[PDB]
Amino acid sequence: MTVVPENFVPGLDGVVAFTTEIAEPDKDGGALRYRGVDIEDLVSQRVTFGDVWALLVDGNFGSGLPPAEPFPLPIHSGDVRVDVQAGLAMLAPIWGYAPLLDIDDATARQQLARASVMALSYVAQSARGIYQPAVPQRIIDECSTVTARFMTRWQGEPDPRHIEAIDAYWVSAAEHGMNASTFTARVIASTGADVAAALSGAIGAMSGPLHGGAPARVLPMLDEVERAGDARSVVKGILDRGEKLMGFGHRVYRAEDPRARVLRAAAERLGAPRYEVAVAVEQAALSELRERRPDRAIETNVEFWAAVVLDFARVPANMMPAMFTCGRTAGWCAHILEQKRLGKLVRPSAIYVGPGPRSPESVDGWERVLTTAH
Amino acid sequence: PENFVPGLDGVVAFTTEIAEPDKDGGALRYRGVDIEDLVSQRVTFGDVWALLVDGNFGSGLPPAEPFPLPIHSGDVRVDVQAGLAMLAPIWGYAPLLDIDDATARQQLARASVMALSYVAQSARGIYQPAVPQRIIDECSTVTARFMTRWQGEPDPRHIEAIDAYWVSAAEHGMNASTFTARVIASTGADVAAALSGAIGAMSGPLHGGAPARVLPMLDEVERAGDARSVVKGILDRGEKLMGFGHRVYRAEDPRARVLRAAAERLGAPRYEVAVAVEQAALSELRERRPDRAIETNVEFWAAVVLDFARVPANMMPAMFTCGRTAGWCAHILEQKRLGKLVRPSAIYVGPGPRSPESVDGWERVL
């Protein structure tokens, strides 16, 4: 049994695994930048998601995400995350993706872009479901952005205001430093595996409820406030019965999350019908939490306004984790390529603290083991 | 960031009670039990799966249920990565966060044995009819079921060789696939999603541990007839000698020793040449660097044993994956009970603030 080092912390909390040039969540400064470019300037100027993908991955504009080729989704599992996780892995043999170790940066960059947009197409197809006929490719070819193509392939005739909402949300959710799925993408890429395998594994980590970042589960709250007309009494009733206010908690940035601000502004600008009730809930929830526990720094989670914006765009609640996955594909691809250029296998250690040497016959249940001596 | 080393190299990420690859002490132990005891006494893979996962004997891996593999991608690794992921909706796998240990353990066993069944079906391929379940039901162990599902009528000596290999390969401490399994599990995801991602990381050529590509060497020696000449020849033409190198354990890898013994005991036809190649390779290498500890890679005898059991070279990575499912499942259950997200950090060193207009290609953005 080995001694545990004095400085050991479980979960690698606060342990630096990489340096990165991709994006800076400036929590002290209250700002988020992608390759130096402020997120507010990207969203406010309505830079489309396909261009922000290229910015994060390449470090500049000029080679946006291309449209998806026609490819009917082969997986129908009843879960969107499963469909895209399995379907992406299956791309490597049919498309001829070699291991990352065997290809140059340019080929890796092309495979990342080709697979990244197919992930969005797969999500749109899986969301539309098997009980509807597909949207013809020539209808989707009318669109001029990838986001508009995604909304058309899914909804057929989407409101242009809802297309704008998704574009704001995806840009705001594209990248945010190291997290379990970004980390998983880099670990798999560090083995030299193909890019589809890395994206597939990252989707698996994204699906975990403790990953963080998924749109908050706030729709029953906003329904409870619509029908009662009083946000503060609802907010107090939730807290007084022992429940938790979804979408609010400890600060992430110094104060307001810059992403929460752009999504509140988008919901306002695009006229989301739930906007006022959501703002009334925000005021009442911050008020109640801040006087109940005035030592804690409490702020609105961006995830609160993520759910508002997606609900506006007609995204069902059980589809919101998939929409988060779709925007984060930009950051996943940027980190995969950065990890490719790094060329270092990720390999931490483990310390053994279990039982010492012992015979099989000393282990509980050995008598219930059948072995042949033929 | 002064003398910072990326990739968590050497950083301790977990403590574990599962197994001790005591390389510097010269022994491998699964829950304290020496691997040589397990293999020499012919403990079947399904019972070692339980030992690693539970910490005790008695609740072996169950047989797979009938379930024709739905993914036929041309890549066996892809078939099982995707197929495992698809198990969660049809089987009702809730996230790890939402279930108790007994339910998680049950789901790990059910999916782990389906992975073996999927590999067996993928390797047998779609151009052959499936083996009927009633023939597979005649088997008394999971490894026997695997080789029956694949080969239809497997030689029992070949089933024994596979049992030896899979137990030798079930677990070996922290590596990229085990680490990936733990990270995914630490998010609270379902166990199929963790095994699926682990298979992705396992497929990378830098992962390490897959059976060595030594069959052309063995081919040339059995043809040319003289091992030392061939070994000299390979080194002299500038190539490297597959399956031999710097020591891994203190001296002989204990998994190498049990795999060689099993090839000898089961009468593998290639055994005599493989032994000739081993002695020649170590002698020739020990001559060229006399102050270096040189040992046979276990992966050398892995290829010999697998080739004996009629595993084609392109199916050896999947055979390695099959065995390692036991360690993956053990580590997922341990991560579950640990209940702590794996959240490392990254340090920004990129450009400072700038406007979108100043960025190359801004003239192309609409």
XYZ file of C-alpha atoms in Angstrom, chain A residues 1-2 4-5 8-25 27 33-38 41-42 45-48 51 55 59-63 75-79 81-82 85-87 89-94 99-102 176-181 183-184 187-188 190-194 196-198 200-202 204-211 335 342 344-361 363-374, chain B residues 1 4-21 29-34 37-38 41-44 47 51 55-58 70-75 77-79 81-83 85-90 93 95-98 141 160 173-177 179-180 183-190 192-194 196-207 265 331 335 338-357 359-366:
246
model
C 0.000 0.000 0.000
C 1.663 3.175 -1.303
C -0.545 9.212 -0.906
C 1.455 12.366 -1.768
C -2.651 15.049 -4.016
C -6.184 16.274 -4.788
C -8.776 13.941 -6.349
C -10.256 14.793 -9.724
C -7.158 16.760 -10.839
C -8.875 19.858 -9.420
C -6.690 22.890 -10.108
C -4.048 20.742 -11.813
C -2.824 22.303 -15.053
C -2.993 19.799 -17.916
C -2.404 22.067 -20.920
C -1.611 25.515 -22.132
C -3.930 26.734 -24.870
C -4.133 29.559 -27.394
C -7.751 28.885 -28.365
C -9.889 31.009 -26.046
C -9.695 32.883 -22.754
C -12.522 32.857 -20.191
C -13.308 35.441 -15.172
C -12.678 35.871 -25.923
C -12.213 33.446 -28.827
C -8.672 33.948 -30.161
C -8.774 37.434 -28.638
C -12.151 38.317 -30.187
C -14.744 39.221 -27.556
C -18.638 41.529 -30.449
C -19.151 38.227 -32.283
C -22.382 41.670 -34.977
C -24.189 38.384 -35.821
C -21.146 36.431 -36.948
C -22.616 33.083 -37.911
C -17.457 31.432 -39.130
C -12.026 31.284 -35.959
C -7.167 31.234 -35.464
C -8.667 33.447 -38.184
C -11.634 33.759 -40.511
C -11.780 32.838 -44.191
C -12.529 29.090 -44.205
C -28.890 5.207 -36.292
C -32.364 5.521 -34.733
C -31.986 4.697 -31.045
C -34.625 6.950 -29.488
C -31.900 9.156 -27.957
C -27.056 11.938 -28.057
C -26.757 8.214 -28.801
C -22.262 9.609 -30.722
C -22.553 6.259 -32.523
C -23.058 7.765 -35.982
C -17.744 6.916 -34.789
C -19.090 5.086 -37.868
C -17.803 7.863 -40.177
C -14.143 6.797 -40.019
C -14.360 3.540 -42.057
C -16.828 4.781 -44.692
C -5.435 7.694 -37.345
C -4.407 11.258 -36.482
C -0.807 10.036 -36.227
C -0.744 9.210 -39.961
C -15.182 27.653 -22.575
C -11.784 26.304 -21.614
C -11.217 22.861 -20.181
C -14.129 20.603 -19.246
C -14.681 16.858 -19.150
C -15.719 16.510 -22.810
C -10.592 16.895 -22.001
C -11.905 13.564 -23.298
C -7.099 12.384 -24.390
C -8.365 10.310 -27.327
C -3.422 12.171 -27.854
C -3.459 8.423 -28.600
C -3.323 9.208 -32.321
C -6.856 7.872 -32.855
C -8.970 9.179 -35.716
C -14.310 10.773 -35.414
C -13.381 8.560 -32.455
C -12.333 11.608 -30.430
C -17.595 10.414 -30.418
C -15.990 9.951 -26.996
C -16.400 13.643 -26.144
C -20.237 10.494 -24.320
C -18.690 12.712 -21.639
C -20.957 15.639 -22.566
C -24.010 13.454 -21.848
C -23.135 13.135 -18.152
C -25.349 15.231 -15.883
C -22.379 16.428 -13.809
C -20.492 17.695 -16.885
C -8.729 21.450 -29.144
C 1.156 19.064 -29.407
C 2.159 14.379 -26.425
C 0.239 11.385 -25.084
C -1.797 12.213 -21.972
C -0.785 9.710 -19.275
C -1.345 10.380 -15.562
C -0.554 7.800 -12.879
C -2.487 5.850 -10.263
C -1.339 4.901 -6.758
C -2.239 1.448 -5.410
C -3.778 1.405 -1.919
C -5.458 -1.995 -2.047
C -4.776 -5.394 -0.493
C -1.297 -6.835 -0.423
C -0.209 -10.091 -2.020
C -2.542 -12.972 -1.243
C -3.516 -16.406 -2.506
C -6.691 -17.059 -4.524
C -7.978 -19.315 -1.730
C -10.372 -14.348 -1.358
C -14.063 -14.539 -0.484
C -15.957 -16.928 -2.752
C -13.020 -18.882 -4.202
C -14.857 -22.145 -3.472
C -17.582 -21.050 -5.941
C -14.977 -20.878 -8.742
C -14.927 -23.766 -11.202
C -11.604 -24.592 -12.867
C -10.733 -27.467 -15.186
C -7.521 -29.480 -14.973
C -8.063 -31.546 -18.135
C 4.526 27.407 -16.109
C 5.774 22.825 -17.077
C 5.285 19.398 -18.678
C 2.013 18.868 -20.586
C 0.018 15.667 -20.719
C -0.165 15.010 -16.949
C 3.023 12.969 -17.345
C 3.677 11.206 -14.042
C 0.975 13.207 -12.236
C -0.998 11.083 -9.780
C -4.663 11.274 -10.799
C -6.273 8.514 -8.689
C -5.747 6.016 -5.937
C -7.056 2.523 -6.677
C -7.729 -0.791 -4.958
C -8.286 -2.712 -8.190
C -4.886 -4.036 -9.252
C -1.160 -3.443 -8.773
C 1.104 -3.602 -11.837
C -1.651 -8.557 -8.929
C -5.420 -8.331 -9.454
C -6.888 -7.385 -6.060
C -3.772 -8.847 -4.432
C -3.974 -12.154 -6.344
C -0.915 -12.831 -8.477
C -1.808 -17.929 -9.936
C -4.885 -16.908 -11.938
C -4.867 -22.447 -12.282
C -6.978 -21.635 -15.370
C -9.432 -19.209 -13.797
C -11.701 -18.336 -16.706
C -14.473 -15.139 -13.037
C -12.685 -10.458 -9.110
C -12.992 -7.518 -5.189
C -14.026 -11.138 -4.599
C -14.969 -14.327 -6.433
C -18.420 -15.753 -6.985
C -26.792 -3.972 -35.638
C -23.605 -2.153 -36.738
C -21.610 -3.476 -39.720
C -19.055 -0.737 -40.412
C -16.119 -2.776 -41.712
C -14.122 -1.873 -38.576
C -13.589 -1.476 -33.186
C -16.234 0.868 -34.613
C -18.970 -1.788 -34.529
C -17.928 1.426 -29.939
C -21.201 2.381 -31.636
C -23.122 -0.760 -30.651
C -23.433 3.263 -27.000
C -26.759 2.229 -28.555
C -27.434 -0.172 -25.639
C -28.536 2.598 -23.241
C -31.935 3.509 -24.822
C -33.118 -0.006 -25.676
C -29.602 2.533 -18.798
C -27.036 7.904 -15.840
C -24.564 6.632 -13.245
C -25.628 9.542 -11.018
C -29.202 8.186 -10.890
C -17.878 -20.493 -19.930
C -7.940 -22.237 -23.330
C -3.297 0.264 -14.233
C -3.758 3.706 -15.693
C -3.699 4.214 -19.461
C -5.576 6.315 -21.983
C -8.577 3.986 -22.334
C -8.532 7.106 -17.990
C -11.147 7.956 -20.619
C -13.462 10.713 -16.961
C -16.708 9.838 -18.753
C -17.995 7.959 -15.700
C -17.042 10.910 -13.467
C -19.583 13.077 -15.356
C -22.330 10.717 -14.172
C -23.073 9.379 -17.676
C -24.419 5.874 -18.235
C -22.449 2.204 -22.013
C -21.346 5.760 -22.800
C -18.177 5.251 -20.730
C -17.950 3.364 -25.769
C -15.558 6.279 -25.267
C -12.913 4.008 -23.745
C -12.954 1.976 -26.971
C -12.269 5.162 -28.933
C -9.138 5.892 -26.876
C -8.079 2.226 -27.114
C -8.079 2.409 -30.921
C -5.210 4.925 -31.011
C -1.842 3.540 -32.144
C -0.069 5.333 -29.275
C -2.281 3.759 -26.599
C 1.324 -26.613 -22.681
C -12.452 1.322 -12.887
C -15.008 6.026 -10.189
C -15.561 8.021 -5.748
C -18.211 10.529 -6.834
C -15.798 13.258 -7.944
C -15.702 14.971 -11.336
C -12.339 14.948 -13.124
C -11.820 18.666 -13.838
C -8.248 19.610 -14.766
C -7.313 23.113 -15.892
C -5.806 24.842 -18.910
C -3.625 27.973 -18.976
C -4.270 30.597 -21.661
C -1.197 31.861 -23.547
C -2.823 33.059 -26.759
C -3.318 36.520 -28.249
C -4.719 39.430 -26.286
C -7.930 41.346 -26.933
C -8.588 42.450 -30.500
C -11.497 43.401 -32.725
C -12.985 41.139 -35.410
C -11.902 43.598 -38.108
C -8.388 39.288 -37.850
C -7.136 37.713 -41.079
C -9.948 36.908 -43.475
C -12.490 39.261 -41.874
C -13.166 40.517 -45.413
C -14.796 37.126 -46.149
C -17.306 37.163 -43.264
C -20.910 38.053 -44.148
